[PDB]
């Protein structure tokens, strides 16, 4: 869809999950948006 | 295919299908579709 669905410096609406605690099951879906356990345990909605 | 209401792979869209014809010679094979493939069995076999 790049021919019709792209912007010069846009297309921020296209999102994908970059990190997760564990892999999803076959044909499984996850819509949660909790902070990833980046090295440390997942922080509860804060920086750290 | 044409709904395009899945702009983000995160929170992807799902559908269930039953009670129809499934003529794959047209589906996934018209000009708009750039790529198409089947795993484990050829489309020619799936056609029937």
């Amino acid at each position, epitope marked *: 869809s790049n021919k*019709l*669905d792209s*912007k010069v410096s*846009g297309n*921020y*609406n296209y*999102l994908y999950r970059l990190f997760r605690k564990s892999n999803l099951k076959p044909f499984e879906r996850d*819509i949660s*948006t*909790e*902070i990833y356990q980046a090295g440390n345990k997942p922080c*509860n*909605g*804060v*920086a750290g | 295919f044409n709904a*395009t*209401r*899945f*702009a*983000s792979v*995160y*929170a992807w*869209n799902r559908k269930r299908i039953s009670n129809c014809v499934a003529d794959y010679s047209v589906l996934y094979n018209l000009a708009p579709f750039f790529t198409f493939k089947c795993y484990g069995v050829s489309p020619t076999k799936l056609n029937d």
Partner: antibody
Amino acid sequence: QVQLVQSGAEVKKPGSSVKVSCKASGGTFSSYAISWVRQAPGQGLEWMGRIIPIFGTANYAQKFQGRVTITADESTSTAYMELSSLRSEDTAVYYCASLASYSSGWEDVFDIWGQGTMVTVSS
Amino acid sequence: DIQMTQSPSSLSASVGDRVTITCRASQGISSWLAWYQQKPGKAPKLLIYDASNLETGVPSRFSGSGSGTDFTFTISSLQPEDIATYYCQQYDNLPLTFGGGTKVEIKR
């Protein structure tokens, strides 16, 4: 339920800088997003910026880039906007909005506002 | 940047009459265009976000369609409580552009 609470009336001299707030409540704060909008007495709408407090990413309109900044903190459960170079034309009703449209197939449109803060710039 | 217009700028009809409006944009698209119902100084209510699509909670009283640079928006019926201004919005690209407005009111 999800709700937004805004501050009271605020006024400042031209050319100054002002701080405004939008208190979010209900459900889980980390799952919400906040946006800011301005509404005059009949002029068209203006959109200032957008933030995702859980992740801290923000973006802006070209008209307000540089002169305006947004910060939001979960611990205080409110979102903040920073304004500078205020002028008389800013006299309007200032609204904060929640963009829940990012995780269920609903995309990039608000469905919840606060009470709205009227603002005025005059000598 | 993306610019759009609405025509006609005002509608007047009696209670229970059919209403329709159209919105034009600068670039031809087939999705990512929204519609709003707005009143002076009051919050807009979302009815359409993408071409001919709506959420849960949107009443069946509103509808829209179109292709290319012109999309239509239709209202099944009108009542006095509906005195407001319909608006079209577009978000194919980040510089969101908002419509010129169409007033709707009651004939008498």
